Design a protein around this ligand. Structure first.
Ligand SMILES: COCCOc1ccc2c(c1)ncn2-c1ccc2cccc(N3CCC(N)CC3)c2n1
Length: 290
């Protein structure tokens, strides 16, 4: 049973105006769309079920995880529709762009970095409290509203802890951002997300994660074997220490999301999310390029 499945008489090509492609996630392409009843903009993931071979269960799991989340920091799921062989999956649209998009005009300042990290941490705190693990935290999966609100996206590989399975062992994620214990397929939990957050912090500061120049298969040994990455360059000591705190090889040595919300880098530098509109405006004016 697929949570939020609508009446199969409903025609999504009638109910929604499909616009441009805006992304490609772990499973399926995502489009901008208009809800023709409300005129609100939505994000629509479209899946050809006739093609999908092993990914239908994955697609279903993603929708299930989203449907179980109710947070200002997690993309909303509205429902799903069928048009012949294609599944239209209707979700929240955030018009500011991903944090990675917003990096294209130039570097972030540490106030922007701290603000974005703080909001990511609020989302992680929510998820981890629900015993969920995102497992694909990276700047491309951090979306901003046109007002500067920051939300987590793409739950395509998200994990669920239960009283039966206290830990996971699945090899999932995006290689450069994956925790060493995930790569080794040791037993892991929400601390894996804290490692990915540290990598994302480096990404927000420098524009790319560590090892970005290498073939992803090399991280299969590099991340488990090497000392953890550090933030190199002219950045504040609290930011460098924030990164170090996240990027410890031992998961029990990483702070919780809740704890990092009080980290000196966050408290000293983060400001109102509304200020992030400057970053969104910067990107709009920048992509006014021929
Ligand atoms: C240039 O920026 C234009 C806005 O770009 C986007 C891109 C994706 C968006 C979005 C806005 N508003 C909501 N989403 C969603 C909504 C539901 C999603 C489900 C699975 C995967 C997604 N994305 C996340 C961003 C990533 N970069 C690619 C895959 C999803 N993205």
């Amino acid at each position: 049973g697929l949570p939020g499945m609508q009446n199969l008489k409903a025609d999504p090509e009638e109910l929604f105006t499909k616009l441009e492609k805006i992304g490609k996630g772990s499973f399926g392409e995502v489009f901008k769309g208009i809800d023709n009843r409300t005129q609100k903009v939505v994000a629509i993931k479209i899946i050809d079920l006739e093609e999908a071979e092993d990914e239908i269960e994955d697609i279903q799991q993603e929708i299930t995880v989203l449907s179980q989340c109710d947070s200002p920091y997690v993309t909303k799921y509205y429902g799903s529709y069928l048009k012949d062989t294609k599944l239209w999956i209707i979700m929240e649209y955030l018009g500011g762009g991903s944090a990675l998009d917003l990096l294209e005009p130039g570097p972030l300042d540490e106030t922007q970095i701290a603000t974005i990290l703080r909001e990511i941490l609020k989302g992680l705190d929510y998820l981890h409290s629900e015993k969920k693990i995102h497992r694909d935290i990276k700047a491309a999966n951090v979306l901003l509203s046109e007002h500067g609100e920051v939300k987590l996206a793409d739950f395509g590989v998200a994990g669920q802890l239960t009283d039966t399975q206290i830990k996971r062992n699945t090899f999932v994620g995006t290689p450069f951002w994956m925790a060493p214990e995930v790569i080794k397929q040791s037993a892991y939990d929400s601390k894996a997300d804290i490692w990915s957050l540290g990598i994302t912090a480096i990404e927000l500061a420098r524009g790319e994660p560590p090892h970005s120049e290498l073939h992803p298969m090399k991280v299969l040994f590099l991340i488990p074997k090497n000392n953890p990455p550090t933030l190199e360059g002219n950045y504040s000591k609290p930011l460098k220490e924030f990164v170090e705190a996240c990027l410890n090889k031992e998961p029990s040595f990483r702070p919780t999301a809740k704890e990092l919300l009080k980290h000196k880098f966050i408290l000293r530098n983060a400001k109102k999310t509304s200020y992030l509109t400057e970053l969104i405006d910067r990107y709009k004016r920048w992509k006014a390029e021929q």
